[PDB]
Structures are given as C-alpha cells and as structure tokens.
Design a protein around this ligand. Structure first.
Ligand SMILES: O=c1cc[nH]c(=O)[nH]1
Ligand code: SF4
Length: 202
C-alpha cells in the first residue's frame, strides 16, 4: 500500500536510509539484496535522481557506482560540478530484474509506491535544483505524460514539489552507453550541457 507507512517523520538522512532498509512498500524488496538509499549530505544544493540501483549498486549499497555512474562522473567533471557537493538518489530504492542479473524498468505502480522516500529526501536536503536523469525519474515528479526528449535542458518549476526547486530533466547516462558509438560525442555533449543548466540556476 506504498512506502508511506514505512517512512519515519524525520529529516535525518541516516534514519531515513535505515528505515528504507525495512520497507515492504512494493514487491521489489523481495529479490533485491538491500535498499540503496541516496548518498550525500543535507548541505547539498543540487539533488540528482536516477531510475533505480543497478546490478553493482544493489551490492555496493551506493547509487551510481556501475558504468552508468562512471559516465555520470565523467559528465560531472566536464560540467565543473563536484559529486561530493551533491545528493544523489533514485526514483526506486530496490533493484528490479529478471534472469547475469538483468535490469527491468520499474512499473508506474512501483514508482508511485516508492515516491514517499523521495519526497522525504527532498524535504530534508532542500535542494535549489533537482536533476532528473531519465524518463522514470522525470515521470515521478512531472506526471505520466512527461517526455524527456521534448523538454531536456529547460528550467522547470512545478506546483506540487516540496521547496519549489528548479527542475531540469535529461537523459539517463545509460542511454548514452546503449547508444551507437558514432553519436556518443554529441549525446555526451547533450548531457554535459543539461547539467550546466542545472549548475547555473542561481
Ligand atoms: O544509481 C543508479 C545506478 C544505475 N542507474 C540508475 O538510474 N541509478
Ligand atoms: S521499492 Fe521503494 S517501495 Fe518498493 S519496497 Fe523498495 S523501498 Fe519500499
């Protein structure tokens, strides 16, 4: 019936993560190893939200540590942003997969179920800017009909979001990895640019 009953009313990030460890909000906690809560401290100005922990993250207990995360770090270095100044997290907290462990897009039901954790992280960190990496992260805050390819690199502000942070959407780093090698320099320039829009929001 949602993560809501499993969410403590606290701004402490460590208490949130520990309690996320006990969530039975949707079925995703069954096959994953552990919940992967975000990383960073409350002092961060910029929050970055991906889709879900992948194979590596599920085992490392940290978000964006696999290939997608390595590419994301290269894009951060190129955008002159430091990762330790950020708060990084995911729309869904448990890794969803089929049988190598193969990575399955979270369903809308799962996304709505896990959203209370994300709201809690936002009320705590109070970012000035949220960066949405990919479609599922973006739909999570902007509705089921939000299309990233149409609105990428635009400073968005929406009513319902806690704190009225600017919101900037972009492609998930793993889209670049999955894309053809010949477009990778233009796609990467695309991600780096959207990140610089977020960083240049005052
Ligand atoms: O933390 C992660 C890792 C891979 N993909 C994501 O969306 N988030
Ligand atoms: S995914 Fe989000 S909701 Fe479903 S179980 Fe893990 S934490 Fe609870």
């Amino acid at each position: 019936a949602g993560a809501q009953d499993f969410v403590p009313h606290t701004a402490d990030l460590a208490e949130l993560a520990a309690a996320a460890g006990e969530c039975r909000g949707c079925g995703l906690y069954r096959d994953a190893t552990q919940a992967v809560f975000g990383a960073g401290g409350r002092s961060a100005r910029i929050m970055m939200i991906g889709e879900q922990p992948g194979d590596k993250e599920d085992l490392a207990g940290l978000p964006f540590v696999g290939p997608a995360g390595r590419l994301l770090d290269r894009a951060l270095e190129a955008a002159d942003i430091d990762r330790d100044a950020l708060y990084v997290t995911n729309a869904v907290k448990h890794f969803k997969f089929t049988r190598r462990r193969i990575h399955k897009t979270p369903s809308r039901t799962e996304v709505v179920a896990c959203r209370p954790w994300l709201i809690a992280e936002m009320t705590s960190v109070e970012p000035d800017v949220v960066v949405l990496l990919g479609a599922t992260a973006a739909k999570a805050l902007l509705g089921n009909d939000f299309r990233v390819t149409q609105h990428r690199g635009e400073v968005l502000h929406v009513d319902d979001v806690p704190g009225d942070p600017a919101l900037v959407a972009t492609v998930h780093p793993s889209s670049l990895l999955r894309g053809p090698k010949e477009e990778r320099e233009s796609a990467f320039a695309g991600l780096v640019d959207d990140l610089r829009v977020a960083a240049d929001v005052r």
